[PDB]
Amino acid sequence: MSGMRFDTRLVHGGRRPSAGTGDVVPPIHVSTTYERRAQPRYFYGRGENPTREELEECLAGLERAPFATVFSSGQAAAATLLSLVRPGQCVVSTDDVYAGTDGLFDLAARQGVRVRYADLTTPEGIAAALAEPDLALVWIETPTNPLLTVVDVAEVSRRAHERGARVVVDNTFASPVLQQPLALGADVSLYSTTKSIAGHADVLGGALVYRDADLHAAVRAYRTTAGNVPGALDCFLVRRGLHTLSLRVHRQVATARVLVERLRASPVVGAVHYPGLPEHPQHAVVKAQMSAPGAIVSFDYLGGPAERLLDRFTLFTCGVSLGGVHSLVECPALMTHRPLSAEARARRGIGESLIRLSVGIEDPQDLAEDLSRALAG
Amino acid sequence: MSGMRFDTRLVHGGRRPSAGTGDVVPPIHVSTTYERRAQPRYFYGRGENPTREELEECLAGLERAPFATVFSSGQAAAATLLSLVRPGQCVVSTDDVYAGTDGLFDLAARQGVRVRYADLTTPEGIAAALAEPDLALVWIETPTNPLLTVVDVAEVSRRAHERGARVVVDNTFASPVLQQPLALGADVSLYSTTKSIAGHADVLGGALVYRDADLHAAVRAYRTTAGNVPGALDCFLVRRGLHTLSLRVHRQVATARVLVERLRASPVVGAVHYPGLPEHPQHAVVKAQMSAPGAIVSFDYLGGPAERLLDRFTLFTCGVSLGGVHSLVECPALMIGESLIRLSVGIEDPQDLAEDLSRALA
Amino acid sequence: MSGMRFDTRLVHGGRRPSAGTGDVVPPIHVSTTYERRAQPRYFYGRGENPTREELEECLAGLERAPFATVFSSGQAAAATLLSLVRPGQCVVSTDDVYAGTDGLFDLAARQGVRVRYADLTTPEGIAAALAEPDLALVWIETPTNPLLTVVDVAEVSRRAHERGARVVVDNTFASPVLQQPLALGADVSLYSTTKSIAGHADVLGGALVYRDADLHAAVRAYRTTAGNVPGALDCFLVRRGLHTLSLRVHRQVATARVLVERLRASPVVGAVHYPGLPEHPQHAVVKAQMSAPGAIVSFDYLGGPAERLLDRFTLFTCGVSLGGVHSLVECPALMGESLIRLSVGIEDPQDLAEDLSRALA
Amino acid sequence: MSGMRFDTRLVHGGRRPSAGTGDVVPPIHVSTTYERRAQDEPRYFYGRGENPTREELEECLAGLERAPFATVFSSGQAAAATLLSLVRPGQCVVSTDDVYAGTDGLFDLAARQGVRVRYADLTTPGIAAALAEPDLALVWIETPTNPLLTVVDVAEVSRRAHERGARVVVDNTFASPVLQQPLALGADVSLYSTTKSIAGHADVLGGALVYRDADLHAAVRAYRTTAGNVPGALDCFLVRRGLHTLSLRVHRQVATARVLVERLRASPVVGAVHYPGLPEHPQHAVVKAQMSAPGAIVSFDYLGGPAERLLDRFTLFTCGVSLGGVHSLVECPALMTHGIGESLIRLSVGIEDPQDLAEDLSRALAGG
């Protein structure tokens, strides 16, 4: 795939043509076991599988990276990377990370990993955070959920590498269509492929994309031992969804922009959060590192109880997750951030009436009409 | 899905709620049999299946039609419709029809059906064609393969209905994104969903979309008896591909236009066939019945035997079929001049495809 | 697979090695299209598919036959075979065929095929039946549904071939574990693989198994033109179920014998139909052509409306189809008026016997 | 499934009715996301946490051991990793010396987290010494062992371990719940690679834990959700589908293994033959007390020359690792997976015809 552009690699990356039969779509390798005398690289499915390898080759290609490793889930990918941090070492992350990531951070702390939360949006926040001794890993999620703030990956990576730390970007929100963490200076891109990469809300998966060969050996050794491998049929569905990733993301972004303007015009809407708004507090950073501002929107609803707003949607689905072809709506205080106390949410800037939209690929006018009907301004 | 626009119907058409569990993507119904005391519409998988029905509901909705029936393949859909023509009756069709369709025509002829091929692009061709006695079915493929000629569906349908005949359009090439045969006056839209509807070259399927309730009973009776039904996992894959149909088709068309301009400037290219060219012999009809001119292109290669060109592609795949995410190239005569080449445009980067095409031609 | 016994062929028949990777289970070929320059037998999925071919090789091997062809369903396999009969020619069939088969016979008749139903259990029935002019096909279902009548395949085949007719046996009920129609002299074995061959009630399929090369060309030409091909994922599920076919059938038969003993001892049961009973009117034929008497049983219920009996089962499932791991019960007249049919699954025989007894009570 | 016998539970365990349509085989729930307003009782939020197809498989597995809980995983390793994650810094795990290589791999990781791992001989009243360890949290029993097929008395070790307050897990992958019931024997957890005989068709990876403790249940589910080592729905469907025929396959495999053992005992190029069913097996009394049949794994010392040459001669047995599937497998632990001689050979007996398998084995042993 040398010289081929992004949209071509989506279709042909890892597409091994089939010797003898010539299948355009590679066959699905379900076998757990391999005949030793018929080859000698394939021994057992937990360690080796061609369908899985083809997906990894495709993902790596999307970032022009030498390596990728896929997992049973996004959580499993994060767990694997975090497992490389030793007791006594430090991970610096931000406060507002994905609840699952925080869940993993809690597990790591109980094994003696130091987790330090920080403000990575200011020079003083960054300097303070990276002053931590034995700093092993800087964990960046950008844009963040659900307030959609962004962290300057290139700048944090520069400062972090001065301290000898590894930098990972959870790039699930943006996808490699919109953001290229390795090109920005990060060491690892982390994905829940469950979201926009597979894109059809019908399979779980995770991925790490990176360039370091020692990291590659460590990641592969842990996956084989921990056994957090995806099934071949799952890899097939992720790979199949991947073909249309740039098509889907481009449509989702265009519709999100339309919905943001509807929200700004509604009398029952307060603050509107979107990386693309000119008045976004980190607009220069968004423009510098995202080719488009994404398909997630959040806003403060002023018109009455959030539960009633959620009940009025007839096209948007009320549920968690994001990135899929079906548009979704949730209220973080009632759903994704319900386990937190009201005081914890207040401290994080997550109001009771904050609403989050994940824009799918439905007709933008249908989505706009459903939103207006629900808002009932 | 009333009031919902096309792209919304692609995502939510037939997206039946799961009571209790609340699944957004409906679960895949693989069971061949059903407990009778637990219900009473479902008896046996060949007759009834919820996953298959959801796909049919989606397809019917894309044409705002009351009925759709899916099949194990496009050929099976065609066979089913053709089975309704009785011995002694006549089918009139476009001359360049799909070889499989012609294969079916040969079978029908051996059953006492009269098959007549005709030029349906002229008023004289149509009048001559539709003068056949016992005319039961007019079989229109438009645009045609591989010269991409176009037939006026509304006009042929008007004349055919005066003779009481049924009109089917094989709408595989254009897809319902670009052409709406029922809205143009046809009685049936026929699809190989194997091509652009499923779109990922990993499943076979067919479909009929139509409005007549008597036709519906006959089509379903034949499918149940002949058993040319698709599997549930196949319906799942077709339905999954359908979500992105308008995304894929719009991209394929945009890139086809880019390739056509590259072809027109190549000195080893002669005639270029594409419904979107201003000088296309039926361009007025294209503008009237297609919302965009499609993703299939054909052209005369002047540089020698087609094999010389075909061996040089490094991104296009040399193989048959069309409509998929992977770009395909073939020589119809090998796989209509000896050096006529047909392109099926996929969703790769247009500049990569244009470079591969230019490299092969040079 | 030469020299390998039946149970081995179930596991390794058509199990083509994967060059390079060495997969023990062959990978699933979903691709509809093939690169021409990368080979040249594979052009398009409706015509050619390695996963489908592997299943066909396995099925042919189970009857030591050169050819097999699989289809989207048992009905499609039957329809394909029926398409070879010309208007004006005659098909002779057993009177007790599958309802779907009767549906196909009606379709064929509306195209000018003559269908004659006959008693193929007596010498006079056979002689009368096979006297039809232009006899093209003799259609044997044995044991029959739902009365479990049995037809002597070797004898009918002998007489039919004298008349130049082709003989097909619908071998769905028995499966190739219990009955081998080609070895008995028939020309074609027909299967709904939907039933015991796939065995898990989760995929539709059909198959024809035969030896004639001209028939092969005709069958494949029709399948390609009619497009009644199965998908690769479906072929995968059928092939996967096939591994355990003899294990499942042996268990089902053993349990069926226990249930038959229960039925015969019930005061609310009249006639009991089962090929293995000494008093079955064709028991000598059963002993000569079936290695075991099958897993299907039917009987007359005398205790009241069939619906009342059906409602009382708590383990048997009330539904159509047969051959699967789940035991099924149906009333043919609703789905004599009081005839009940059992399809025995692989549950514990004592659990199934208790359920049947509670229901009859 | 109350009152139903084992073979019935294989077919109907977890076979949840489909409201409205009445599907006999439950539909495959592939959706990762769930509509919140569509649930009378809100149980499904997100696929990593909840999935009906996965739950039906778990319900079936739990039912096979008459246990209240089961949890399935992306692999056997992931099931083991989950259980091992619950051992805290400062605590001790005691294990059978000859454990599965992957289990040893996990033990190495745990040791780097401040867990003390002690290997022991649990076949002799070895047990007392082993269980004298301070802070003993977990006793890890694999029985029969691989590849020498020695057996550990589960009830006895469980008795001694519980006096010390330790948890007892049995890796029951080799025997399967058809032949051995660790929870009925006194253990706290049954651990499976369902990749092997439970799925049985060598076409899906999976793992499982089966247990009774509700506090354990909460911890195991919390870890699986956070670590994300969950299986896909299509994989659960394939494991569940394979499970239907589990007792049929195992009974056949055992019968054929007994035939092969007799063939092996008659060979001039075979030394020691290892099989739990042999009368002279050193733990024969324990085998009879805790296994309903002696299993489908056989190993033996090959005396005829280099093992690599022997492996090349099989034409029906497949040379490869893993076990329990419908296809018979052969390996040489010293050359492949690993008192294990250079010429020790292990057979995993499949469901092929016993006479075909015996002839292939005899042909390979004879050479020529």
Side-chain angles (χ1 to χ4, degrees), chain C residues 1 3-8 11-12 15 24-25 198 200-203 236-238 240-241 243-244 246-248 251 314-315 317 325-328 346-348 350-351 354 358, chain D residues 1 3-8 11-12 15 24-25 199 201-204 237-239 241-242 244-245 247-249 252 315-316 318 326-329 351-353 355-356 359 363:
Chain C
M1 270 298 101
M4 292 310 179
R5 297 167 171 90
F6 189 91
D7 289 359
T8 301
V11 177
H12 297 283
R15 194 177 64 74
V24 170
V25 178
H200 297 70
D202 57 14
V203 62
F236 172 77
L237 291 175
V238 175
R240 188 188 203 251
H243 292 291
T244 52
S246 64
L247 293 179
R248 292 180 283 103
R251 165 75 161 230
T314 58
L315 183 52
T317 293
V325 292
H326 329 80
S327 292
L328 299 166
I346 62 170
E347 304 95 333
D348 190 281
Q350 291 306 110
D351 289 336
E354 288 166 11
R358 280 190 294 272
Chain D
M1 270 298 100
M4 292 311 178
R5 297 167 172 91
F6 188 94
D7 290 0
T8 301
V11 177
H12 296 284
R15 195 177 65 75
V24 171
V25 178
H201 295 71
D203 59 15
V204 62
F237 169 78
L238 290 172
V239 175
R241 187 189 203 250
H244 289 291
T245 51
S247 64
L248 294 178
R249 292 181 283 102
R252 164 75 160 228
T315 60
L316 183 51
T318 298
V326 294
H327 328 80
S328 292
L329 299 171
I351 63 169
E352 302 96 333
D353 189 283
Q355 284 306 111
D356 289 336
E359 289 166 12
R363 277 187 288 101

Side-chain angles (χ1 to χ4, degrees), chain B residues 288-309:
Chain B
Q289 73 186 20
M290 302 180 73
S291 59
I296 309 300
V297 186
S298 71
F299 64 95
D300 290 321
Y301 173 59
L302 309 178
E307 303 87 311
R308 187 191 189 187
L309 178 69

Side-chain angles (χ1 to χ4, degrees), chain D residues 240-260:
Chain D
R240 178 69 188 88
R241 187 189 203 250
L243 198 36
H244 289 291
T245 51
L246 177 61
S247 64
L248 294 178
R249 292 181 283 102
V250 168
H251 293 329
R252 164 75 160 228
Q253 291 172 313
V254 170
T256 296
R258 290 177 145 137
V259 170
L260 297 180

